Design a protein around this motif. Structure first.
Motif, PDB file in Angstrom:
ATOM      1  N   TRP A 301      79.314  23.958  61.714  1.00 38.60           N
ATOM      2  CA  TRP A 301      79.119  22.626  62.263  1.00 38.60           C
ATOM      3  C   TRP A 301      80.344  22.186  63.054  1.00 38.60           C
ATOM      4  CZ3 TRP A 301      75.428  19.248  63.293  1.00 38.60           C
ATOM      5  CH2 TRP A 301      74.208  19.330  62.618  1.00 38.60           C
ATOM      6  N   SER A 302      80.173  21.126  63.835  1.00 36.62           N
ATOM      7  CA  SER A 302      81.245  20.613  64.669  1.00 36.62           C
ATOM      8  C   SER A 302      81.347  19.102  64.541  1.00 36.62           C
ATOM      9  CB  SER A 302      81.027  20.976  66.141  1.00 36.62           C
ATOM     10  OG  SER A 302      81.560  19.975  66.987  1.00 36.62           O
ATOM     11  N   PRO A 303      82.554  18.553  64.675  1.00 36.23           N
ATOM     12  CA  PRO A 303      82.747  17.107  64.532  1.00 36.23           C
ATOM     13  C   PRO A 303      82.052  16.255  65.580  1.00 36.23           C
ATOM     14  CG  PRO A 303      84.845  18.256  64.346  1.00 36.23           C
ATOM     15  CD  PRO A 303      83.794  19.310  64.450  1.00 36.23           C
ATOM     16  N   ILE A 304      81.289  16.829  66.505  1.00 37.23           N
ATOM     17  CA  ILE A 304      80.626  16.028  67.529  1.00 37.23           C
ATOM     18  C   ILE A 304      79.125  16.104  67.267  1.00 37.23           C
ATOM     19  CG2 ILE A 304      80.614  15.494  69.990  1.00 37.23           C
ATOM     20  CD1 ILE A 304      82.937  17.498  70.247  1.00 37.23           C
ATOM     21  N   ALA A 332      76.397   9.847  61.897  1.00 36.79           N
ATOM     22  CA  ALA A 332      77.631  10.182  62.600  1.00 36.79           C
ATOM     23  C   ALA A 332      77.559   9.768  64.065  1.00 36.79           C
ATOM     24  CB  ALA A 332      77.919  11.675  62.470  1.00 36.79           C
ATOM     25  N   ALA A 628      88.964  12.708  63.413  1.00 39.85           N
ATOM     26  CA  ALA A 628      88.112  13.806  63.858  1.00 39.85           C
ATOM     27  C   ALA A 628      87.527  13.526  65.236  1.00 39.85           C
ATOM     28  CB  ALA A 628      87.002  14.056  62.842  1.00 39.85           C
ATOM     29  N   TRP A 629      87.153  12.274  65.502  1.00 41.22           N
ATOM     30  CA  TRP A 629      86.681  11.903  66.828  1.00 41.22           C
ATOM     31  C   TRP A 629      87.727  12.142  67.902  1.00 41.22           C
ATOM     32  CZ3 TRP A 629      82.684  12.338  64.546  1.00 41.22           C
ATOM     33  CH2 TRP A 629      81.965  11.397  63.810  1.00 41.22           C
TER      34      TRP A 629
ATOM     35  N   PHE B  20      84.850  26.597  63.301  1.00 43.14           N
ATOM     36  CA  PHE B  20      85.642  25.644  64.059  1.00 43.14           C
ATOM     37  C   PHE B  20      86.895  25.262  63.276  1.00 43.14           C
ATOM     38  CE2 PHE B  20      81.411  25.110  65.810  1.00 43.14           C
ATOM     39  CZ  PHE B  20      81.668  25.068  67.157  1.00 43.14           C
ATOM     40  N   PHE B  22      89.312  22.023  63.169  1.00 40.71           N
ATOM     41  CA  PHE B  22      89.101  20.734  62.523  1.00 40.71           C
ATOM     42  C   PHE B  22      88.515  19.741  63.515  1.00 40.71           C
ATOM     43  CE2 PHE B  22      91.105  16.509  62.165  1.00 40.71           C
ATOM     44  CZ  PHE B  22      90.392  16.028  61.100  1.00 40.71           C
ATOM     45  N   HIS B  23      88.683  20.030  64.803  1.00 39.29           N
ATOM     46  CA  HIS B  23      88.277  19.129  65.868  1.00 39.29           C
ATOM     47  C   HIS B  23      87.077  19.636  66.642  1.00 39.29           C
ATOM     48  CE1 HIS B  23      91.874  16.503  65.695  1.00 39.29           C
ATOM     49  NE2 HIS B  23      92.522  17.609  65.380  1.00 39.29           N
ATOM     50  N   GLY B  24      86.783  20.927  66.568  1.00 35.62           N
ATOM     51  CA  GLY B  24      85.741  21.494  67.391  1.00 35.62           C
ATOM     52  C   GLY B  24      86.217  21.950  68.746  1.00 35.62           C
ATOM     53  N   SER B 267      75.157  25.300  55.111  1.00 39.12           N
ATOM     54  CA  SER B 267      76.268  24.557  55.682  1.00 39.12           C
ATOM     55  C   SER B 267      76.012  23.060  55.590  1.00 39.12           C
ATOM     56  CB  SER B 267      76.519  24.941  57.133  1.00 39.12           C
ATOM     57  OG  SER B 267      77.184  23.892  57.802  1.00 39.12           O
ATOM     58  N   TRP B 268      77.069  22.286  55.829  1.00 39.93           N
ATOM     59  CA  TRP B 268      77.037  20.834  55.711  1.00 39.93           C
ATOM     60  C   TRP B 268      77.733  20.203  56.905  1.00 39.93           C
ATOM     61  CZ3 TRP B 268      74.359  17.447  53.101  1.00 39.93           C
ATOM     62  CH2 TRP B 268      73.777  17.814  51.888  1.00 39.93           C
ATOM     63  N   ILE B 270      80.039  16.982  58.793  1.00 43.50           N
ATOM     64  CA  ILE B 270      81.283  16.290  58.479  1.00 43.50           C
ATOM     65  C   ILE B 270      81.014  15.105  57.564  1.00 43.50           C
ATOM     66  CG2 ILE B 270      81.008  15.306  60.773  1.00 43.50           C
ATOM     67  CD1 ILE B 270      84.099  14.689  60.559  1.00 43.50           C
ATOM     68  N   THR B 271      80.000  14.307  57.884  1.00 54.44           N
ATOM     69  CA  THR B 271      79.586  13.205  57.030  1.00 54.44           C
ATOM     70  C   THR B 271      78.927  13.672  55.740  1.00 54.44           C
ATOM     71  OG1 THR B 271      79.365  11.599  58.824  1.00 54.44           O
ATOM     72  CG2 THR B 271      77.982  11.278  56.890  1.00 54.44           C
TER      73      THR B 271
END
Ligand SMILES: [Zn+2]
Ligand SMILES: [Zn+2]
Ligand SMILES: [Zn+2]
Ligand SMILES: [Zn+2]
Lengths: 744, 302
Positions: A301-304, A332, A628-629, B20, B22-24, B267-268, B270-271
């Motif tokens: 997964w990715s923070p976006i 999110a 993270a954003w 990834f 931490f930021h992508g 997988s999960w 970020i939230t």
């Protein structure tokens, strides 16, 4: 024992083997060969010519070739349709050919007396060309692709490694499984052997004992084949099983995976040699499905709110709808959208945050209107930030009435603070809800206004309201004119009729009005428990009518119900106390929102709620999410907000510089240190000592300290910025490290 | 509502992971050719290749990233019975310390949460979990294996607890992939009693009877309880309410068979609200929660 195969030259051309041979193109059939009833053994020509030409061995064991293609000048027809019987009658066992030299081909038969069994004959263009193994069973006949004078055979209980150039030259190895013996083109030293539900694997260089042994599945393994376009992949098929198990031979543990190409039992599964890891399964019901088994899939997964998944060699990605409709995606995405829209931060008029939040969500309607009311009253004024429970905790002086007087300051003043906060009574002391009703009628909520009036005891005004609402935009006047039956009769047609119809209505406000009108004297539990109606109005009506003892039951029960259910609209009841914190905990556990949790708590909190270990975790986790954003500046603004509204928070712990003679800090002559007045450091560029004076700009940015964390060499900000813009070495002579690029 | 696309990247051999940072903006993929490579998304949205280098003798299965505060390191395990670390020098990566203390194939490697330091957990087929330490963020060429945990079974996957609230003691989840005819719990949880200063078995999930492929922990984000997803014949989600080891209130929340196959990876987000699962059926199904607090699918991708 039917199977399937495709044309070795044409990928799209496939063959369906049955009691009658059928050729199809990739399915549409090409021809139906029913001239070979009772088939036993099938072989194909290694040479391209003739097209769709095959070799078949029936129970008679004769070497006969049949073809299905349309050839106008076929080069070799003297063997097309030819028949080559043996020297004795043995049943068909196996048949193959050598692609190295298509002229020579080998066949296997059952047990005759002492005639030939492993007989190899050339189809020309009588008798076998090369023969061996008299009076024996040849379970499999095969040719070595590499060594044109080599082959592997399977006896009744042994497998021999012989050669064509010398008939007596052979290497026989004892084994229990001799079925399904084959070597993959990539794996020249790997041999196979199947035994019912068990499979035996052996190495050619170590052809003495089984190199690998597989589990003996209950159903016997029917067909086992190697992957035609993969490395170290083999598949074994069983009887009446929807999924065919497989093993991984690329280890040198073997990963075992099974794939079901169909939901019904398939007689045999054959992978097209030309296609890249594509398998074709054939069932007895004349249904063929081409299923290409895929390998293991990884995820990340990715923070976006984006998902990247690898399926084999190629890389793929999934985006976030991008439709601006439906449920506004996952929390999110809404959180990022709100952060980009400067949500919660706009605190000059509170209620605007409901439009600032994007769509219309009723949950984020009660919070911000309640929060606006509390701030608005205290500006004029534990007072507001206590909830209805604390407000009416010491309620006294409420009088009930058996019958309403058809047709507000008579109430106790503290009992009127609840009315003020519930949005009915304006800021002033006027008992006239007139402005509220006028705003309601302007808003078009005709039924809501009618309910408010009925609670306010203006039946005629409510009738006028309903008539006016039904003038614009037909059942509204119908209900309104019907409504005039209200009375106190024991068995009124109005009374029984409305008691029946109270559940027949559709608009919740109309239903509530009917229930109130038909409510028995004393008991008003119909109105106060309409979960389809607003909590605000029900609480306000209860405060307006119910007595002292009949409010402390309703308020407490409603508060526990809202807390357990996590309804945000109950914040007006809970207030900003530990009870409100529990309610917000339930809301966060349900929805997963931390902006609505962080900004709500920081809005006017006495220094007991903010000290909780829960109310700090949400802020810290929201700040991390903002990290993270990579929304640095939004986080900085939120930090300003939190710091000015929460004294307990201690800002970041960083570096301070210290003198070399005094030994103490310089943070509060400017050039002189304040400790003992000994000279401060100096720029490496200006050679002038540093210093800062501890509208008119008192201390510009250009004069601030700045130093390399590896050198401890420093100077003015502006001069260092200029120096490192055109150069890249430590400004001081004899220094070495590249100061700027260390961090950039 | 999830739509797919295609990523402009070319490889030779089959790859086994993607991760990834931490930021992508940095992924790390390990190929079947013992060659790991690191991409780097640019300002224009494109993906470039920055490095590549062959690894040890075995076959790499896992490559993981680290928190940016500690630098930029990656841990990778392979059948070489060793675990590795890698740091950027600028960009030529360097080996720092090969944690080689395992007599079996170290299947999984994972990084501890930021709030407690630089730890990494590995266990191999022998069935013993190891926890390592870097008590000097300066030099990465020195590590210490404090605790060894006997599992009395094998390992398939492990996962830490992202939660960083002071109430929750450190937790770890150890799986198994043993198909022995007997029936036993294949997923177990250990806690860390500060008084005893050791890791103790806390709770096990008796409902698990088949072999387990992967385990993950849903991030907390300030919730009260915990969320855990287990890969089995069917995707299952459990929640463990807190009450020696702390007693846990365990009750299932979901049980999904919409794959007709064996689940491989879990997988999960970020939230911690969307689950992505992959299986032998060749499809990727994403599950989210609805207004009725019900767990249902949201998109089937292949
Ligand atoms: Zn000093
Ligand atoms: Zn210097
Ligand atoms: Zn200067
Ligand atoms: Zn420097």
């Amino acid at each position: 024992k039917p199977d399937i195969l495709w044309a070795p030259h044409h990928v799209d051309r496939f063959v369906v083997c049955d009691s009658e041979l059928s050729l199809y193109h990739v399915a549409t059939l090409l021809s139906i060969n029913s001239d070979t009833p009772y088939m036993k053994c099938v072989a194909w020509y290694l040479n391209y010519d003739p097209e769709c030409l095959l070799a078949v061995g029936q129970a008679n064991g004769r070497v006969v070739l049949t073809s299905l293609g349309q050839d106008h000048n076929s080069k070799f027809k003297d063997l097309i349709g030819k028949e080559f019987v043996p020297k004795h009658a043995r049943q068909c066992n196996t048949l193959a050919w050598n692609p190295l030299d298509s002229n020579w081909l080998a066949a296997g038969l059952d047990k005759h007396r002492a005639d030939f069994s492993v007989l190899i004959w050339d189809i020309c263009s009588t008798k076998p060309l090369y023969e061996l193994g008299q009076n024996d069973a040849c379970l499999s006949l095969c040719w070595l692709p590499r060594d044109q004078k080599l082959l592997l055979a399977g006896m009744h209980r042994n497998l021999a490694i012989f050669d064509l150039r010398n008939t007596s030259q052979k290497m026989f190895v004892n084994t229990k499984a001799v079925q399904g013996v084959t070597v993959d083109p990539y794996f020249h030293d790997r041999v196979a052997s199947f035994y019912e539900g068990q499979v035996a694997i052996w190495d050619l260089r170590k052809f003495e004992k089984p190199v690998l042994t597989l589990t003996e599945q209950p159903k016997p393994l029917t067909k086992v084949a190697w992957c035609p376009t993969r490395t170290g992949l083999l598949a074994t098929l069983t009887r009446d099983s929807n999924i065919i198990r497989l093993y991984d031979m690329q280890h040198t543990t073997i990963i075992e995976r099974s794939v079901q190409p169909c939901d019904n039992y398939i007689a045999s599964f054959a992978w097209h040699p030309t296609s890249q890891n594509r398998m074709i399964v054939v069932t007895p019901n004349r249904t063929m499905s081409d299923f290409t088994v895929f390998e293991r899939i990884s995820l990340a997964w990715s923070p976006i709110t984006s998902l990247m998944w690898a399926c084999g060699r190629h890389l793929y990605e999934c985006t976030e709808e991008e439709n601006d409709n439906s449920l506004e995606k996952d929390i999110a995405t809404k959180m990022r959208l709100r952060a980009l829209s400067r949500y919660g931060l706009d605190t000059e008029q509170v209620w605007r945050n409901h439009i600032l939040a994007g769509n219309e969500d009723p949950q984020l309607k009660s919070l911000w209107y309640t929060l606006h009311f509390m701030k608005q009253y205290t500006e004029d004024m534990s007072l507001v930030y206590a909830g209805i429970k604390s407000i009416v905790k010491s309620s006294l002086g409420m009088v009930e009435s058996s019958r309403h007087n058809w047709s507000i300051q008579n109430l106790n003043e503290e009992r009127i603070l609840a009315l003020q906060l519930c949005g009915w009574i304006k800021k002033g002391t006027d008992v006239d809800v007139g402005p509220f009703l006028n705003s309601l009628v302007q808003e078009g909520e005709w039924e809501r206004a009618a309910a408010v009036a009925l609670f306010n005891l203006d039946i005629r005004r409510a009738i006028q309201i309903l008539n006016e609402g039904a003038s614009s935009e037909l059942n509204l006047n119908v209900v309104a004119m019907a409504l005039s039956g209200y009375t106190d009769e024991k068995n009124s047609l109005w009374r029984e009729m409305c008691s029946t119809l109270r559940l027949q209505l559709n608009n919740p406000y109309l239903c509530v009005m009917f229930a109130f009108l038909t409510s028995e004297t004393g008991s008003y539990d119909g109105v106060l428990y309409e979960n389809k109606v607003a909590v605000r109005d029900r609480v306000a009506f209860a405060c307006k009518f119910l007595s002292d003892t009949q409010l402390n039951r309703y308020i407490e029960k409603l508060t526990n119900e809202m807390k357990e259910a996590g309804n945000l609209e109950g914040i007006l009841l809970t207030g900003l106390t530990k009870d409100g914190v529990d309610l917000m905990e339930s809301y966060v556990d349900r929805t997963g929102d931390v902006q609505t949790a962080s900004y709500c708590m920081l809005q006017g909190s006495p220094l007991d709620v903010l000290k909780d270990e829960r109310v700090q975790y949400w802020i810290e986790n929201y700040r991390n999410l903002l990290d993270a954003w990579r929304f640095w500046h939004k986080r900085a603004e939120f930090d300003i907000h939190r710091s000015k509204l929460d004294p307990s928070s201690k800002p970041l712990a960083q570096v301070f510089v210290s003198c070399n003679f005094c030994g103490k800090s310089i943070s509060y002559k400017v050039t002189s240190c304040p400790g003992c007045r000994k000279p401060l450091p100096r720029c490496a560029l200006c050679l002038i000592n540093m210093g800062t004076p501890v509208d008119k700009k008192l201390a510009q940015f250009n004069n601030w300290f700045t130093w390399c964390h590896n050198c401890r060499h420093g100077g003015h900000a502006g001069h260092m910025l200029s120096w490192f813009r055109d150069h890249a070495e430590c400004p001081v002579s004899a220094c070495t490290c590249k100061c700027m690029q260390l961090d950039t | 509502m999830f739509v797919a696309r295609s990523i402009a990247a070319d490889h030779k051999d089959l790859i086994h992971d993607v991760s990834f940072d931490f930021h992508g903006r940095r992924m790390a993929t390990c190929s079947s050719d013992q060659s790991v490579k690191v991409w780097d998304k640019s300002e224009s949205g494109d993906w470039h290749c920055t490095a590549s280098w062959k690894t040890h003798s075995g076959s790499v299965w896992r490559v993981t990233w680290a928190h940016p505060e500690f630098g930029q390191v990656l841990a990778s395990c392979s059948f070489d019975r060793t675990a590795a670390v890698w740091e950027e020098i600028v960009s030529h990566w360097v080996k720092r310390t090969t944690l080689v203390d395992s007599r079996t194939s170290v299947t999984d490697v994972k990084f501890a949460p930021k709030h407690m330091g630089l730890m990494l957990a590995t266990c191999s087929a022998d069935g013993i979990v190891r926890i390592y330490e870097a008590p000097d963020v300066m030099n990465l060429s020195q590590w210490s294996l404090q605790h060894e945990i006997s599992c009395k079974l094998s390992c398939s996957c492990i996962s830490w607890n992202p939660s960083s609230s002071r109430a929750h003691s450190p937790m770890i989840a150890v799986g198994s992939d043993d198909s022995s005819p007997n029936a036993m719990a294949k997923v177990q949880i250990f806690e860390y009693n500060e008084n005893t200063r050791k890791y103790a078995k806390a709770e096990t999930l008796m409902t698990v009877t088949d072999p387990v492929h992967d385990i993950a922990f849903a991030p907390n984000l300030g919730r009260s309880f915990h969320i855990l997803a287990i890969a089995t014949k069917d995707v299952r989600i459990f929640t463990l309410k807190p009450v020696g080891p702390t007693k846990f209130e365990i009750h299932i929340v979901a049980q999904f068979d919409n794959h007709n196959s064996q689940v491989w990876r879990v997988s999960w987000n970020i939230t911690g609200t969307v689950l992505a699962s992959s299986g032998d059926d060749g499809c990727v199904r994403l599950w989210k929660a609805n207004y009725m607090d019900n767990w249902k699918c949201t998109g089937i991708l292949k």
